[PDB]
């Protein structure tokens, strides 16, 4: 699963059959790290209109 974002520690608790989480637009907003089983929020990198 490729992407670009900022990885932060998450308060969401995934069920053991769940690997990722999707938002309204079906983009991965939360992911489980496959080595250390912790949940990470994926915030999109900051975008500002110029």
């Amino acid at each position: 699963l490729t992407g670009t974002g900022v990885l932060t520690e998450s308060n969401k608790k995934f069920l053991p059959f769940q690997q990722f989480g999707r938002d309204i637009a079906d983009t991965t907003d939360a992911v489980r790290d496959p080595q250390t089983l912790e949940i990470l929020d994926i915030t999109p990198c900051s975008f500002g209109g110029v």
Binding site: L1, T2, G3, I24, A25, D26, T27
Partner: protein, 198 residues
């Protein structure tokens, strides 16, 4: 539900944004709705086709959103032109237009700011406690027909008076509040009463 007109506009705009965000979850006939999945799964000759399907679906969704946004912008512009007309004619002046500045005879108005809107407090005059009177078009006196300058001839049963039209204020029928035009032979329904001279 007093402020439903502003909340309707807010709900329509938020629902249009939610629909536009929700349209990204649709694949529009492609293998996936995620662009990164297509770009990581397929070679560019067929990923070009899948991305083309996603592009035309999302472009159709965005053009649709812009179309109803322009239609709602025209509606809001018409409502704002109406609000500017009400601000000019009801707040900055007294309007003779019926029901333009509230129900009743318009006295004055107050503007109040509202979230994405304006609230006009229309202060109006409503007639109340009306009473029957016997009326005549003219008063016959000395072979002359007398007509009210600004009021109306009324009678409480025995005596004739002249009053202003929107409020009962009986006054003695004199030469100062009546004017003379013609004799009594022409006006249908003219009655006989004296006309006082100060």
């Amino acid at each position: 539900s007093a402020l439903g007109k502003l909340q309707d506009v807010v709900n329509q705009n938020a629902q249009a944004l939610n629909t536009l965000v929700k349209q990204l979850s649709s694949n529009f006939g492609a293998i996936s709705s995620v662009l990164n999945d297509i770009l990581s799964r397929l070679d560019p000759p067929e990923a070009e086709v899948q991305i083309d399907r996603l592009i035309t679906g999302r472009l159709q969704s965005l053009q649709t959103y812009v179309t109803q946004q322009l239609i709602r912008a025209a509606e809001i512009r018409a409502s704002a032109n109406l609000a500017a007309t009400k601000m000019s004619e009801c707040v900055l002046g007294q309007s003779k237009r019926v029901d333009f500045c509230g129900k009743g005879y318009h006295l004055m108005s107050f503007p109040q700011s509202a979230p994405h809107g304006v609230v006009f407090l229309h202060v109006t005059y409503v007639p109340a406690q009306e009473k029957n009177f016997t009326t005549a078009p003219a008063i016959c006196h000395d072979g002359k027909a007398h007509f009210p300058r600004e009021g109306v001839f009324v009678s409480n049963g025995t005596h004739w008076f002249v009053t202003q039209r929107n409020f009962y204020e009986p006054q003695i029928i004199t030469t100062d509040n009546t004017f003379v035009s013609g004799n009594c032979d022409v006006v249908i329904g003219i009655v006989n009463n004296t006309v006082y001279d100060p």
